């Protein structure tokens, strides 16, 4: 896939944040560009690591998740603060763990596909045949090739490791061999980290990327800042993305025989509700949309069974009825939303 | 496939009141069945709607989670969030959850083997009495004397093992507990409010970051197998009097879409809890004293003054919720529970005068 | 066991002196065990053991009641100091060490059975026959049933884990203990054990703190409460003689081994109890444990010469007690 | 052994400290008295533990060492401060490991006799193959005992025969019986864990199950601590035994204070004890062909030298005698090879010559 | 070995220069080993090794005496830094010692196998595979793995460096290490995968500068387990000149044979050696005194140009003279910052 083909696929899931989509696409394209090179340059070239920057919940992780899911690559998210108190080599360990017929012959074959120890026996042959078809030395060694060639690692909240300054910067030095390249031992095999791609992310409000150790700053060639989502983006996130949470709730109630429909003004007042809570108390980003939506739909989701065969409409009046009383009280909103 | 009203109606048989918490947990369990009906793509994108219970201790937050999992026959575990402040790894939650799912699926599988094994064990022991060369007449004549009762007597126990071992399938069982954990698993994290936010704030919020992969989804290794946490349901609870859910790390606040506050229990609810729930503690004491041949009966005014006694202690000193009912009842019944052997064949009646006699002197002194 | 609660206390009176309320409280818990088994399938799960919290000064027999109670029921038993977990070891070790005691308990008891049949069918033959007679799956699984059904655990000095820095570590131990009483499942090399029906006995002086200082989930898991009274001088005189295999009876048979006959006068027993009481008041009160230190100091001269005194009848009188003791009791230093 | 026989044997090694000798003798004698009792009392009776008290180096440990060596019992010395940092159960584990090597080497001593007889009968079969002892059978038995792969083969038969004679289930289980019935443990510097007060008293609670009785798992087997005897020791100048936790104070029924050694005690310790350090240096130089002899005034000035150092700097007790003696004899001990066939005399003038400049 | 104490010192003089008191002290300990075996069954248990405490500034040869002493006795040896345990279990000392004794007795057993195997392999005949099968056929593992245990228990030697640094907060952890070391000297038994070893008869050598602390600051139980005390003197400029040449396989002799490998012949003038010792002394006085270790840093700095060109210099005879030493050094010794 060309870099524009990657961004266009990411637009199907993430909304906006095109600069982060363009930056990740360059890294994945360099993978294919490297394989076309000669024996010497393939060793000298190393992945272009990315450092995402921005407030929480704007989709930094989702880009890394959909990117690895787009490439079918191994992926893991690790909190950098986990190591302030486990060995750093566990990152690669957990990454590898995630990585002509007779007439009676047809007459019985028909009754078999139609359905029918006998019934238990069909399941045991799937194991014996799939084991006979599978190649374990080509499989356990494939996950190693999938990690080494295609592997991806997302390091969240890297800005928080910038008394404590020795332990904080000590985690950076422990992370250093993985990016500069090294070899880690695992029960599944011996993995090399040279060509693994990495994505670090942090708000960087307390610290700056310059505060990172110099050896780490040079191993993160690509830098990108992700913009904060607005109320208008909340309305888009509720609907536009494939399998959006509103589409999920609609199909969920459809299973009960109920038909949910959201008005544009009803969607607009949900985004306004999630925005008010982030401003009134604490800003969690687009994550607030999930808490507000379930609070609005809790009465329908409970009653949907008796509501089978009915068409429910979520309007602006319905949103204000179940929400504005909760959003008006900030003491309650921190608990309930 | 129970509908959400069927879930609360079942929960009303045990928990009293707290309907909003019942409605909230029912929505999460129903989304499980609603997800399976969806297509291949949506089943991955949809994730469990996690709940945050809030309220004073002892109002039934855990009992809702306990009866909900018991209602679904799902694996369940309660974990204290403060255990990780000191230390143990956070991954142990899934490990201990699978160990409960293993024993759960195993004992339930024994319930299946308990039947078939007795039939195959009988056919084995009849081969020694009537060796083979429609059941034979002597085959039934011995089969009758066997069921009537009778090394020989030890032999029937050994065949239950060999037959249940011959009947059990370990690859469908140990892999069943994994499917029970991944699909149906439930985890209750008590006192999550105590890990909210300088020195402790790093160790407190560090536990939140350690918990983060389990809710965002991850893979944990266990001796029983490799489990994925993506579809596991979680229930966090806390009083949140010192802190508020907004004090939680932002990645955690968005992984708890459903929030509910549980109301403080009243004196009237205490009277209902003593009697109304199936196998209520009063019914338990009644059958226990029946074992000794004694008949316990509680008057409505006697039940009313026990609930008033437990309420006064929670207000006079510390409010433990409905847990106070257990301490008060045993203190009232301790004299009968000691004498029940000698009281066999007698009808004892717990009245308002009896409750005040054994209690009011104790409740009067804080 | 089907013993009625009065039969339990009467058996406990053979060892412990006084503290009847603690005896009555433990008997109710053991009787509820037999009462539960007669119930139906539903109530047997809902009913849970009535846990007891002993309260009182050290050395008044809190542990002995739990020890003799488990010994009376032939149940597995373990004593654990709650402060051990302040530093560290996992709390689940309680069930692990309990099963290890239950394993050795059911094994040595199973040896007593195979001891009989193997001698008929038969040192080497005792092993082959007992192995031929034993069914290890009924034994290692018996200790599990003995722990789950009959198990008992005594948690000493629980008052010291009550409630800023230590209060987190102190109350943290309470939360770690919480699953065991509320019920849970612990994995052991011997098997998988469930804690739902295990009985527990917590004890503490509670002079610094109070049971109300315990976490609320823990206060509701200890339905039965009892306070143990301080021992008097008269109880010391009873402890010296009345209990089966009392320390005076132990010294008598010990000297009987050497051919010597010890006999204690009532006034001689009376002045030993007065001696142990004065030391507890003059310096520090250790409870009935003082009786052990005072008696050995009195008998050290007889115990030393007992070989040469074979064939003699020695009498411990009030004059003998004052001769070897009062000079020592007079100096508190 | 009766308690007077124990103290009299202890006097052959330790000098003075009779009260500590009388106290340890009562504990070892209660062991034999318990076995003679009935089934019930043998369980109820528990060892009478001892708490030694006094300044360092006065022989507290030597009493425990010679006591266990007198009883052939397993023994271990453990520093209580080792657990301040970090498990207490290792005490029983290391105790059994010493008991394993103790019973094993002692079992080799038994097989040492019979195996030489059976090994000789094996080696005579190759020299005198069989078709009253034969003429050549004795003729080779004589040349064999006179001395002579051949020479290597006699060692291999000692293993096969000692293995054929030994019963390992009676051995690894014997060390367990030696630990449970006869075991002894010396806990040095117990006073330093008295009321850090949480970590100090926490070690006491960790030690509590071992004295109150418990069961510890080991690779060699499962051991019970109920009947093991223990000896705790401490200077108790900073703290007192009353500062110990109450459950620990009642598990130490016997208390004894050991007196500080005097200059007169030093002179006795140098000579009177069996295999005293002066006797050791004498036999060592005798190996080189030299004769050491110490004058009474020369012994008197060595004791005065060790006393002055303990007073002038730090008092280490009788341990000072070892450092002073080796410093005096270092010139002889080096030259002992060339001094063979000579009689050296250690006099007061010799002691002052090599020492007083240092003191 | 039956060597007398003077024979031990005379052999030590072939390697170490001076420090005769430390040589006499170590010789008395090794001789007591042979003196003990001649005693009866009783005295052999009661007598215990006379442990030594070396004292002096760093680099004066405290370790070299312990190394050459064990190498002289063919005994197992290990050097352990006492500060390693301030933060591993102390029992690892005996474990690592047995691991050195295992490889010591094994390679030495190969020296007996290297000969016989070649004869039996010739009779069989691939030549490399038969050395294994024959050496495995000739080797006795129960006499070997048990030999290293006898070598550790009877002949074992341990050197504990910088013991003076373990003499309120650190004082507990510092003195805690002493108590952990105490059982090893008083005698004990340690479990190892190779077997069960007893420490009663092992000899130990502790060393420290003792400028911050004194041996009296050691715990009393440890002071009595170190009967022999010796102080090692600081090396002079004249001693540096001797250390460069006199000792067998001296660093000057090592550099000469190294350049001989390239076909070059190195020769040092007496004045050239004299100006090397003067160079190392000036650095120790001008900045920090590291002892004789300064000789290694100065020599390699002087010879770095020859060591670089030695390939192209094959067949040539080099002479290190006073003019050559001053040319490559005095400019560096001048500037103390460099
Ligand atoms: N641009 C976006 N498109 C789709 N979903 C989003 C977007 N931004 C946030 N989300 C939702 O909010 C959550 C974002 O969390 P995460 O990406 O881990 O935070 P961050 O991006 O700060 O690392 C995800 O669960 C995701 O479903
Ligand atoms: N509504 C209720 N119905 C029935 N029992 C209750 C109720 N509330 C509390 N209880 C009893 O009190 C205890 C509640 O403890 P728990 O539910 O763990 O506290 P919380 O709800 O604060 O987490 C349980 O043992 C339960 O038997
Ligand atoms: N009432 C009693 N009857 C018999 N022995 C007693 C009694 N009280 C104390 N003892 C003796 O004193 C000791 C009591 O210790 P323990 O019971 O552990 O203390 P606590 O009761 O405070 O937990 C035991 O060794 C026991 O032999
Ligand atoms: N009374 C004594 N008799 C013989 N040797 C003694 C005596 N007192 C001390 N020693 C010697 O001094 C050392 C005493 O150390 P130790 O007994 O461990 O000290 P403590 O008695 O304070 O525990 C031993 O090496 C021992 O040889
Ligand atoms: N007297 C000496 N004879 C020979 N070499 C010595 C001498 N003194 C020091 N050395 C050399 O210097 C180094 C001394 O280090 P070491 O002996 O470990 O120091 P220390 O003696 O302080 O323990 C060794 O590498 C050794 O080669």
UniProtKB/Swiss-Prot annotation, chain C:
GO terms for molecular function: ATP binding; ATP hydrolysis activity; identical protein binding; magnesium ion binding; peptidase activity; proteasome-activating activity; protein domain specific binding. It is found in: Cytoplasm. Keywords: ATP-binding, Chaperone, Cytoplasm, Nucleotide-binding, Stress response. Changing residue 221 to E: Complete loss of activity. Forms wild-type complexes with HslV and is able to bind ATP. One of its GO terms (biological process) is proteolysis. Its main location: cytoplasm. It comes from the Bacteria. ATP binds at residues 17, 59-64, 156, 217, 289. InterPro entries: AAA+_ATPase, ATP-dep_Clp_protease_ClpX, ATPase_AAA_core, Clp_ATPase_C, HslU, P-loop_NTPase. Pfam families: AAA, AAA_2. The keyword Membrane does not apply. GO terms for cellular component: cytosol; HslUV protease complex; membrane. Changing residue 162 to V: No effect on ATP hydrolysis. Can support HslV-mediated proteolysis at wild-type levels. Induction: By heat shock. Changing residue 217 to Q: Complete loss of activity. Optimum temperature is 55 degrees Celsius. PANTHER family: ATP-DEPENDENT CLP PROTEASE ATP-BINDING SUBUNIT CLPX-LIKE, MITOCHONDRIAL-RELATED (PTHR48102), ATP-DEPENDENT PROTEASE ATPASE SUBUNIT HSLU (PTHR48102:SF3). ATPase subunit of a proteasome-like degradation complex; this subunit has chaperone activity. The binding of ATP and its subsequent hydrolysis by HslU are essential for unfolding of protein substrates subsequently hydrolyzed by HslV. HslU recognizes the N-terminal part of its protein substrates and unfolds these before they are guided to HslV for hydrolysis. Belongs to the ClpX chaperone family. HslU subfamily. NCBIfam families: hslU, PRK05201.1. A double ring-shaped homohexamer of HslV is capped on each side by a ring-shaped HslU homohexamer. The assembly of the HslU/HslV complex is dependent on binding of ATP. This is ATP-dependent protease ATPase subunit HslU. It comes from Escherichia coli (strain K12).
């Amino acid at each position: 896939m060309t870099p524009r083909e990657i961004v266009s696929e990411l637009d199907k899931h993430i909304i906006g944040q095109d600069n982060a989509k363009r930056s990740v696409a360059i890294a994945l394209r360099n993978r294919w560009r490297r394989m076309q090179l000669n024996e010497e340059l393939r060793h000298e070239v190393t992945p272009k690591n990315i450092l995402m920057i921005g407030p929480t919940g704007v989709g930094k992780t989702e880009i890394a998740r959909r990117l690895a899911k787009l490439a079918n690559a191994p992926f893991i998210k690790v909190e950098a603060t986990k190591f302030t108190e486990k060995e750093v080599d566990s990152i690669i360990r957990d990454l590898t763990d995630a990585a002509e017929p007779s007439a009676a012959r047809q007459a019985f074959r028909k009754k078999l596909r139609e359905g029918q120890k006998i019934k238990d026996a069909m399941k045991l042959l799937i194991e014996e045949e799939a084991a006979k078809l599978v190649n374990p030395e080509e499989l356990k060694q494939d996950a190693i090739d999938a990690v080494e060639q295609h592997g991806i690692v997302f390091i969240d909240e890297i800005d928080k490791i910038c008394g404590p300054d020795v332990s904080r910067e000590g985690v950076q030095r422990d992370l250093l061999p993985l990016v500069e390249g090294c070899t880690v031992s695992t029960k599944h095999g011996m993995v090399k980290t040279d060509h693994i791609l990495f994505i670090a992310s942090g708000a960087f409000q307390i610290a700056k990327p310059s505060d990172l150790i110099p050896e780490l700053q040079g191993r993160l060639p690509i830098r990108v800042e992700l913009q904060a989502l607005t109320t208008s983006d909340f309305e888009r996130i509720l609907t536009e993305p494939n399998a959006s949470i509103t589409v999920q709730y609609k199909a969920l109630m459809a299973t009960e025989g109920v038909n949910i429909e959201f008005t544009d003004s009803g969607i607009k007042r949900i985004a306004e509700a999630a925005w008010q809570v982030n401003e009134s108390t604490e800003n969690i980003g687009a994550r607030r949309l999930h808490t507000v939506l379930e609070r609005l739909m809790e009465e329908i989701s409970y009653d949907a069974s008796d509501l089978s065969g009915q068409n429910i409409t979520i309007d602006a009046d319905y949103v204000s009825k179940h929400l504005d009383a909760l959003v008006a009280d900030e003491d309650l909103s921190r608990f309930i939303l």
